[PDB]
Amino acid sequence: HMKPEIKEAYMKTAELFSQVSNCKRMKVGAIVVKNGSILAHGWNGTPSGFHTNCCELEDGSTNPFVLHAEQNALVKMAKSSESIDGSELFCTHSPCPDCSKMIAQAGVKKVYYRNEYRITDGIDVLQQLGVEVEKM
Amino acid sequence: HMKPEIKEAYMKTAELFSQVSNCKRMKVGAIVVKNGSILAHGWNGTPSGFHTNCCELEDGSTNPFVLHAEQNALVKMAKSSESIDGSELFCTHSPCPDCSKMIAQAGVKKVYYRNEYRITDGIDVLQQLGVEVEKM
Amino acid sequence: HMKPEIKEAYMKTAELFSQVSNCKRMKVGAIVVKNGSILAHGWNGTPSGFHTNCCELEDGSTNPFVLHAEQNALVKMAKSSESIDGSELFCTHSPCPDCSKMIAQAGVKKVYYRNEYRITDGIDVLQQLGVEVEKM
Amino acid sequence: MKPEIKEAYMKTAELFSQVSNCKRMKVGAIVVKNGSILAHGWNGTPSGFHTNCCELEDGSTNPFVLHAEQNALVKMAKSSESIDGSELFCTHSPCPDCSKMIAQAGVKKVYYRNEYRITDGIDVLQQLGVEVEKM
Amino acid sequence: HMKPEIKEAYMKTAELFSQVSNCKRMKVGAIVVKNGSILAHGWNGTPSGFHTNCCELEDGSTNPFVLHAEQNALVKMAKSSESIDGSELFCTHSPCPDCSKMIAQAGVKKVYYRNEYRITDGIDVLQQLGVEVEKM
Amino acid sequence: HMKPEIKEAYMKTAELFSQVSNCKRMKVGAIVVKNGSILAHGWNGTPSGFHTNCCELEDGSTNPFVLHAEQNALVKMAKSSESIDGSELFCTHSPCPDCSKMIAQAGVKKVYYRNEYRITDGIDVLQQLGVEVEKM
Ligand SMILES: Nc1ccn([C@H]2C[C@H](O)[C@@H](COP(=O)(O)O)O2)c(=O)n1
Ligand SMILES: Nc1ccn([C@H]2C[C@H](O)[C@@H](COP(=O)(O)O)O2)c(=O)n1
Ligand SMILES: Nc1ccn([C@H]2C[C@H](O)[C@@H](COP(=O)(O)O)O2)c(=O)n1
Ligand SMILES: Nc1ccn([C@H]2C[C@H](O)[C@@H](COP(=O)(O)O)O2)c(=O)n1
Ligand SMILES: Nc1ccn([C@H]2C[C@H](O)[C@@H](COP(=O)(O)O)O2)c(=O)n1
Ligand SMILES: Nc1ccn([C@H]2C[C@H](O)[C@@H](COP(=O)(O)O)O2)c(=O)n1
Ligand SMILES: O=c1ccn([C@H]2C[C@H](O)[C@@H](COP(=O)(O)O)O2)c(=O)[nH]1
Ligand SMILES: O=c1ccn([C@H]2C[C@H](O)[C@@H](COP(=O)(O)O)O2)c(=O)[nH]1
Ligand SMILES: O=c1ccn([C@H]2C[C@H](O)[C@@H](COP(=O)(O)O)O2)c(=O)[nH]1
Numbered sequence: 001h002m003k004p005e006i007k008e009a010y011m012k013t014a015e016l017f018s019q020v021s022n023c024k025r026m027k028v029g030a031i032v033v034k035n036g037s038i039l040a041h042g043w044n045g046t047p048s049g050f051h052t053n054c055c056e057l058e059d060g061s062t063n064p065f066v067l068h069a070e071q072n073a074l075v076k077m078a079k080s081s082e083s084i085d086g087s088e089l090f091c092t093h094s095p096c097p098d099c100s101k102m103i104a105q106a107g108v109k110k111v112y113y114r115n116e117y118r119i120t121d122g123i124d125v126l127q128q129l130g131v132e133v134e135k136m
Numbered sequence: 137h138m139k140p141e142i143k144e145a146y147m148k149t150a151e152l153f154s155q156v157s158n159c160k161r162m163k164v165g166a167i168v169v170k171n172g173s174i175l176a177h178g179w180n181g182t183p184s185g186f187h188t189n190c191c192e193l194e195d196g197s198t199n200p201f202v203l204h205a206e207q208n209a210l211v212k213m214a215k216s217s218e219s220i221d222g223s224e225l226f227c228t229h230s231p232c233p234d235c236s237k238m239i240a241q242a243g244v245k246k247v248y249y250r251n252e253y254r255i256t257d258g259i260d261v262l263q264q265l266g267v268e269v270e271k272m
Numbered sequence: 273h274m275k276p277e278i279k280e281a282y283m284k285t286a287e288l289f290s291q292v293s294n295c296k297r298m299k300v301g302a303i304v305v306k307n308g309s310i311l312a313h314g315w316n317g318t319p320s321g322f323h324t325n326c327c328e329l330e331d332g333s334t335n336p337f338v339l340h341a342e343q344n345a346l347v348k349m350a351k352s353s354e355s356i357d358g359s360e361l362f363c364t365h366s367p368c369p370d371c372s373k374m375i376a377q378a379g380v381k382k383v384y385y386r387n388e389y390r391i392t393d394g395i396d397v398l399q400q401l402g403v404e405v406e407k408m
Numbered sequence: 409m410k411p412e413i414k415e416a417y418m419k420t421a422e423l424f425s426q427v428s429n430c431k432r433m434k435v436g437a438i439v440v441k442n443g444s445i446l447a448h449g450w451n452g453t454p455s456g457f458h459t460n461c462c463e464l465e466d467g468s469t470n471p472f473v474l475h476a477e478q479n480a481l482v483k484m485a486k487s488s489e490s491i492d493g494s495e496l497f498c499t500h501s502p503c504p505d506c507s508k509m510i511a512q513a514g515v516k517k518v519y520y521r522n523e524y525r526i527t528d529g530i531d532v533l534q535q536l537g538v539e540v541e542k543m
Numbered sequence: 544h545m546k547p548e549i550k551e552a553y554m555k556t557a558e559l560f561s562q563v564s565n566c567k568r569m570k571v572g573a574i575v576v577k578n579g580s581i582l583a584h585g586w587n588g589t590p591s592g593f594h595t596n597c598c599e600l601e602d603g604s605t606n607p608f609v610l611h612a613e614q615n616a617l618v619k620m621a622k623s624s625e626s627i628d629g630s631e632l633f634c635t636h637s638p639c640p641d642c643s644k645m646i647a648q649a650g651v652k653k654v655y656y657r658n659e660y661r662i663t664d665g666i667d668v669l670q671q672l673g674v675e676v677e678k679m
Numbered sequence: 680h681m682k683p684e685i686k687e688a689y690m691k692t693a694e695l696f697s698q699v700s701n702c703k704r705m706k707v708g709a710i711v712v713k714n715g716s717i718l719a720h721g722w723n724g725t726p727s728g729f730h731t732n733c734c735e736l737e738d739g740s741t742n743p744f745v746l747h748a749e750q751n752a753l754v755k756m757a758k759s760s761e762s763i764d765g766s767e768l769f770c771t772h773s774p775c776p777d778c779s780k781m782i783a784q785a786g787v788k789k790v791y792y793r794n795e796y797r798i799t800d801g802i803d804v805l806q807q808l809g810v811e812v813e814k815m
């Protein structure tokens with residue numbers, strides 16, 4: 001059903017859209033895949049129309065205004081006319097615990113990720129809520 | 137662009153769905169309205185299939201697993217086949233700064249609320265991102 | 273799998289929207305619920321942009337132009353991008369024979385009602401056409 | 409709208425009216441929006457109803473029968489596309505009860521061919537801001 | 544279900560929409576039918592806004608710019624917000640091999656046809672790709 | 680006008696999905712983009728459920744049964760519940776005149792390409808039918 005070739009293609013598509021991020025700390029990308037369709041592609045950045053597109057606060061920390069690639073993928077799916085329920089998620093980085101909570105409640109059956117985010121606990125949050133997790 | 141009777145009807149519906157929450161600390165409800173349609177009703181609580189519906193810990197603080205009413209309304213809209221963009225939101229309590237971030241990115245033009253959340257900074261966040269706010 | 277707590281909330285929402293009616297004889301409200309979503313909310317009244325709000329003529333009777341709550345919810349569903357088929361209907365009052373007829377042809381599986389309308393034949397029409405009926 | 413498609417939509421209405429099992433009169437209604445026939449309704453008894461007949465022993469129409477416009481309207485609620493800003497092709501001009509709902513549904517125009525016994529329904533349409541054309 | 548009476552009606556509708564064609568060689572109509580709805584109706588003709596209405600050149604052959612009734616039906620379904628998957632296709636003439644290829648890949652379960660087109664290979668192609676074919 | 684880096688991201692996504700193709704002569708990919716969403720991704724190949732996925736005959740030429748990347752993108756949009764009308768197309772190669780015919784009728788307002796396909800007349804067909812063409 002989901003061959004190693006297409007599964008690689010979706011993950012590489014995630015890596016492409018992470019490069020669109022203006023982020024200095026980490027460039028993150030998220031892809032929502034359902035029935036051979038990419039319904040959303042999210043990357044980390046400040047809100048639409050924000051006074052700056054810089055993700056960092058001058059103290060070295062990420063601005064609390066910036067949205068995570070997963071949040072942007074969820075928000076897009078809410079603005080979309082297609083359901084996120086039953087879809088799969090291709091992330092460049094494992095989602096944070098706050099995001100993993102929403103991803104599970106959204107009805108995403110499986111999360112694919114390539115790299116580990118500094119907070120690993122999101123993986124456990126996903127599996128504890130009945131979401132499959134595969135590192136590739 | 138809304139008759140006061142209709143405005144009150146939506147707020148009372150938010151208050152009606154907040155009461156189904158199992159939360160002890162505060163019971164919160166949220167209603168997504170677009171073109172005379174309640175596209176989503178969300179209340180605060182633990183995720184679906186979670187081991188319990190109790191929202192607080194042994195020490196009496198809220199469980200980090202519980203989703204907010206606004207989060208649940210946001211997630212429901214991602215499961216929905218209708219767009220949250222251009223809609224209005226009716227909340228029993230003013231959204232937190234974290235939710236307000238997603239609400240503004242979702243394209244919600246106005247947020248109606250009745251009671252104030254401890255962290256009142258969310259109202260400021262919403263207004264700073266071009267979302268009208270009204271207490272009623 | 274409707275639970276009593278949540279089922280009462282839908283009926284009380286129907287009662288909330290019935291109060292929006294300008295009708296003097298009887299205030300009626302109808303709620304379309306499918307998959308934990310309120311797809312339509314209808315109440316009795318004159319058509320949109322009619323010369324008057326008043327539902328009754330200067331004689332005792334109801335203006336033949338006014339739409340029943342069930343009619344308004346039905347029409348609303350025709351304007352909706354969601355299907356009424358498989359949904360449940362929460363009504364403050366039992367639907368009239370003319371409405372009951374359309375409700376069954378719409379594919380509504382169950383109608384909930386609280387009060388009995390003067391003509392109680394609609395209950396039979398519903399049950400004869402294979403629509404479950406519960407009073408609450 | 410080009411005259412030739414206008415006639416094609418009306419002939420479609422006339423084609424679906426014939427599927428009716430009605431003895432008194434066979435009526436067909438077509439919902440058209442952006443080159444698409446979203447609903448095609450005809451007069452008949454409800455689904456699952458014990459009979460196909462559309463009339464009683466007096467030979468009056470059975471109150472259980474749905475009008476062609478009603479079936480078209482109901483189908484639009486069962487579907488996932490909006491009737492709002494659509495046009496309606498009818499073999500016979502809609503009755504006042506159906507015209508009420510047609511107008512509220514946001515149908516902008518009604519095309520009709522024959523006149524139904526009660527002519528008052530056309531007047532209802534125009535009062536509620538719905539364009540009417542006989543063809 | 545697809546009874547003889549209604550099946551005839553769908554075929555005659557395809558015959559009605561073929562007469563709209565400005566073609567002189569042959570007038571062809573195709574309609575897409577799913578769950579009692581005619582989602583598309585296509586006839587053969589030049590593209591929208593093409594310099595001429597004439598479907599044939601000066602040599603006697605059809606202009607290569609002319610879209611087949613099946614193509615236009617397919618193209619319409621792409622502009623539509625409804626899915627062609629699982630639908631049935633009523634055609635005045637049996638589709639050509641080129642169209643039959645796309646029709647099968649679209650997920651059309653059955654194609655009905657009345658008259659046979661010059662190149663009858665379309666029928667074979669259609670069956671070889673798992674699409675039912677019935678002449679009426 | 681869309682940002683240059685996302686424009687490159689779409690083109691590279693077309694290049695990613697062209698690699699999934701099992702074709703030896705040339706690997707082609709097509710991407711449908713509307714309002715920051717990839718509604719379709721198509722590549723050249725044999726139909727679904729075909730005996731093989733080799734797209735060439737012993738004659739070293741291409742099997743007439745194979746679908747072009749743009750055909751697969753078009754068909755996918757018909758199977759979809761979203762509209763192709765007003766979208767932009769990202770292609771690894773310039774479409775053939777047969778596909779360009781359908782692309783213009785679908786309402787695609789712009790075609791982006793990287794490489795030139797041997798028959799260069801497809802660009803002419805697109806431009807003659809009011810479709811913007813840009814090489815990148
Ligand atoms: N296709 C898109 C478009 C936007 N965004 C997110 C990333 C930034 O957080 C914000 C940027 O908004 P914009 O590009 O409209 O200025 O929106 C996204 O994830 N995917
Ligand atoms: N219409 C609904 C249904 C559910 N929930 C939320 C409330 C709980 O936090 C979580 C669990 O609900 P359930 O018991 O239906 O699985 O889903 C919601 O916000 N709105
Ligand atoms: N959300 C709505 C809006 C309107 N109506 C119906 C009730 C009256 O019959 C009429 C009122 O029209 P308007 O809202 O334009 O004043 O429409 C309804 O049932 N539900
Ligand atoms: N495409 C359809 C199918 C059915 N009906 C209506 C006409 C009759 O009132 C009833 C017939 O019952 P059934 O759907 O079982 O054929 O349904 C309709 O208007 N349009
Ligand atoms: N409902 C429609 C509308 C249009 N067309 C096709 C017929 C012509 O080939 C092309 C051009 O039509 P027009 O000149 O009206 O834009 O559109 C079609 O098949 N079905
Ligand atoms: N997302 C997809 C899925 C399939 N195909 C096309 C490529 C081949 O021509 C055929 C392969 O089908 P499948 O992989 O289901 O066997 O369908 C495509 O272009 N894009
Ligand atoms: O789930 C996540 C977690 C982090 N990110 C992004 C957001 C931040 O700009 C970068 C930097 O991570 P930080 O939280 O600053 O360590 O990570 C994300 O996009 N999605
Ligand atoms: O914006 C908000 C903030 C809190 N809630 C719910 C979440 C918690 O269960 C109760 C109380 O939160 P607390 O942060 O514990 O005060 O509020 C909410 O639903 N929406
Ligand atoms: O099925 C029904 C029956 C009555 N109503 C409403 C419409 C009228 O304004 C009130 C008054 O009842 P009546 O007795 O029909 O005049 O009832 C309704 O909304 N739906």
Ligand SMILES: O=c1ccn([C@H]2C[C@H](O)[C@@H](COP(=O)(O)O)O2)c(=O)[nH]1
Nearest residue numbers: 430432433435451469475476502503
């Ligand atoms: O507006 C109308 C009027 C009548 N019909 C059908 C209803 C009946 O079956 C036939 C005969 O109408 P009658 O009301 O019996 O004259 O017309 C209809 O479908 N739409």
Ligand SMILES: O=c1ccn([C@H]2C[C@H](O)[C@@H](COP(=O)(O)O)O2)c(=O)[nH]1
Nearest residue numbers: 566568569571587605611612638639
């Ligand atoms: O599958 C098909 C095959 C032919 N046609 C139509 C299109 C052309 O205008 C006519 C003439 O075809 P010809 O090949 O010239 O016989 O056939 C079609 O619409 N769909």
Ligand SMILES: O=c1ccn([C@H]2C[C@H](O)[C@@H](COP(=O)(O)O)O2)c(=O)[nH]1
Nearest residue numbers: 704705707723741747748774775796
């Ligand atoms: O416009 C085109 C032309 C060819 N392709 C595919 C078709 C074939 O599989 C390869 C090779 O083309 P050919 O026509 O075989 O040279 O290109 C395509 O997808 N789109």
Ligand SMILES: [Zn+2]
Nearest residue numbers: 068070096099
């Ligand atoms: Zn996160």
Ligand SMILES: [Zn+2]
Nearest residue numbers: 204231232235
């Ligand atoms: Zn919150």
Ligand SMILES: [Zn+2]
Nearest residue numbers: 340342368371
């Ligand atoms: Zn009624």
Ligand SMILES: [Zn+2]
Nearest residue numbers: 475477503506
């Ligand atoms: Zn009628």
Ligand SMILES: [Zn+2]
Nearest residue numbers: 611613639642
């Ligand atoms: Zn053809």
Ligand SMILES: [Zn+2]
Nearest residue numbers: 747774775778
């Ligand atoms: Zn091609």
